[PDB]
Amino acid sequence: SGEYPTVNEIPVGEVRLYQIADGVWSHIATQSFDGAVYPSNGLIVRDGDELLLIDTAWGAKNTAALLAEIEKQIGLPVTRAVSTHFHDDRVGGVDVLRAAGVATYASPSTRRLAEAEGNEIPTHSLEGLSSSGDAVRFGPVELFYPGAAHSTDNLVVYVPSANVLYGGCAVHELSSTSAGNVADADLAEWPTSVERIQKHYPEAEVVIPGHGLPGGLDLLQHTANVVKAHKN
Ligand SMILES: CC(C)c1cccc2c(O[C@@H](C)c3ccccc3)c(C(=O)O)[nH]c12
Ligand SMILES: [Zn+2]
Ligand SMILES: [Zn+2]
Incomplete structure (x- = not known):
């Protein structure tokens, strides 16, 4: 009924949308x-009379439910999707998307890592993102590679029209007391990568983590803090 939906409020297999700004939703x-x-987030950005999707809903059946929820609540077609790193909460559901006719994209790094993991593999490579600090346009968003953090390949997404910063799994929610699933992380580089995000997007008004509740710019420093306390 309005607040951001949490893990115990969403049965596995259901998907909720949350309006972030005009033409911007998260999916949960x-x-x-x-x-x-566990809960996880993605993004939906209106692209004229089409939609751009950022990240799957963490699984095939969840991603099918995501497409159904989009049709119910928004009623515009998803035509392209970007996965922001290779883990299953980002790419699990790409095969569902691809068969629904959605063009799926990720960096070459992400595609390689997904393949090696045995995870689903986006179709198209996103060039121009291989060096930290790189940025490219993709529809109504900017894609930014901040450097290694939660994973070596993690991308963040900015929606300039709305000053929405989607941090993906490189950014933690304020209530987090740990650094999440760090199996593929670079804890030593992560705070430097966060600093790059902070420097590049100083006007961000909403910051969305890969898991948990959106907030403001404080999520970025909080993330650095929780990573530093894990590494220690
Ligand atoms: C490798 C993927 C599929 C995966 C599986 C299981 C859990 C996670 C996870 O912990 C998330 C949910 C988390 C963040 C902060 C505090 C606690 C937890 C993350 C994450 O931190 O991005 N990823 C997870
Ligand atoms: Zn991950
Ligand atoms: Zn994650």
Whole structure:
């Protein structure tokens, strides 16, 4: 009924949308992994009479439910998707998207890592993002590679029309007391990567983490803080 939806409020297999700004939504779904249930976010950005999707809903059936929820609530077609790193909460569901006719994209790094992991693989490579600090336009968003953080390949997404910064899994929510799933992280580089984000997007008004509640720019420093406390 209005607040941002949390893990215990979303059965696995259901998807919620949350309006962030004019023409910008997050999507929220839950999934079981190693015997625990976690929420995760993605983004939807209106692209004229089409939609750009950022990240899957963490699984095939969740991603099918995402497409159905989009049709119910927005009623515009998803024509392109970008996955912001290679983990299943970002690419799991790409095959569903691809068969629905959505053109799926990720950096070459992400595609390689997804393939090596046995995860689903976006179709098209996003060039121009291989060096930290790189930025490219993609429809109504800018894609930015901040450097290694939560993963070596993680991308962030900015929506200039709305000053929305989607940090993906490189950015943690304010309530987080840990650094999440760090199996593929670079904890030593992560704070430098966050600094690059902070410097590049000083006008961001909303910051959306890969998991949990959006907030403001404080999420960026908080992320550096929780990573530093994990590394220590
Ligand atoms: C490798 C993927 C599929 C995965 C599986 C299971 C859990 C995670 C996870 O912990 C997230 C949910 C998290 C962030 C902060 C505090 C606690 C937890 C993350 C993340 O931090 O991005 N990724 C997860
Ligand atoms: Zn991840
Ligand atoms: Zn994640």
